[PDB]
């Protein structure tokens, strides 16, 4: 019943000319990459791709260090790879050349606060990925939009209507518990889920994705197996996603101690936010073809999406 939204021929098509230029460009292709005695034959598609993906400073201070985000895929043999920092595009002239000499196809996306007339003020999480040169320029626009305007302590955000000019060449995942649909799927407001999956399915066919995410944070199942419900009910594609914030486990501590100093806390403040889990980080093919083991539709459309983002 889960939909696995295929790359068209034409995508497919875009895809192989967009391995062709890492290969051009750097000399190996991961993907395309047969083990030492395995054969041509018997080479196999990836099952996962990690399609949200923050470096250390991402929505804090400080810069856009990429290079260790791609030495990890690296390390681990993925054939691509997304970067979806906080509402900037810093880090992806070094992301495309690193990708490159890696082998790695580069994935190109970023990470939103939104704001909808339909959950009044509220802010809420959506990440945009580029699916071609046009999406790619679209992007751009829409993270300019949001520091045009002017910005308070909640920082840039974009109008949910601003999608609707910037469409083109543009693939969303939903925000999980934290996007719209979510927050209105664990509130069991059902009338507000029509409407804004209604905005998605007019504005974005088959290029919205519900994101299922596993990392042991709270109403994460709970929203997972209602966006599952939705999902079978609408005809919608999931996604699994790991939501990356840190490159390795042993990571958290460093990162939990970051964002403590940049929102103004001691650790051992009771009120400290607690909006990160130490499973946000890199987890391998395996783990998460494991943790999904039950979803295999959420994996799929990783690689489908993987294949349809061609920003050269």
């Not at 598609?45 to 260090?65: N, Q, T, W």
């Amino acid at each position: 019943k889960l939909r696995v939204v295929f790359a068209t021929d034409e995508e497919i098509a875009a895809h192989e000319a967009r391995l062709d230029l890492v290969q051009k460009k750097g000399g190996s292709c991961l993907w395309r990459a047969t083990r030492e005695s395995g054969s041509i034959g018997s080479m196999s598609e990836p099952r996962f791709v990690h399609l949200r993906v923050h470096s250390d400073y991402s929505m804090i201070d400080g810069p856009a260090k990429t290079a260790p985000l791609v030495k990890k895929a690296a390390a681990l043999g993925m054939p691509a790879l997304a970067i979806t920092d906080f509402t900037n595009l810093c880090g992806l002239v070094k992301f495309y050349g690193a990708g490159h000499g890696a082998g790695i196809k580069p994935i190109v996306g970023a990470d939103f606060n939104v704001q909808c007339d339909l959950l009044g003020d509220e802010l809420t999480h959506l990440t945009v990925l580029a699916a071609n040169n046009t999406g790619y320029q679209n992007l751009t626009l829409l993270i300019s939009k949001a520091y045009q305007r002017g910005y308070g302590a909640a920082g840039p955000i974009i109008d949910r209507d601003w999608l609707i000019e910037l469409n083109e060449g543009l693939i969303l995942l939903s925000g999980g518990r934290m996007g719209d649909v979510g927050r209105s799927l664990l509130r069991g407001n059902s009338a507000l889920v029509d409407e804004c999956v209604a905005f998605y399915e007019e504005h974005f066919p088959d290029r919205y994705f519900l994101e299922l995410i596993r990392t042991g944070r709270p109403d994460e199942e709970s929203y997972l197996h209602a966006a599952v419900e939705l999902a079978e009910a609408r005809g919608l594609p999931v996604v699994a996603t790991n939501d990356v914030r840190f490159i390795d486990s042993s990571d958290f501590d460093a990162h939990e101690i970051r964002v403590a100093i940049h929102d103004g806390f001691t650790l051992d403040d009771p009120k400290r936010p607690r909006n990160y889990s130490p499973q946000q980080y890199m987890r391998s093919e395996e783990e998460m073809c494991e943790l999904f083991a039950d979803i295999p539709e959420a994996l799929a459309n990783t690689v489908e999406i993987a294949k349809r983002c061609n920003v050269t």
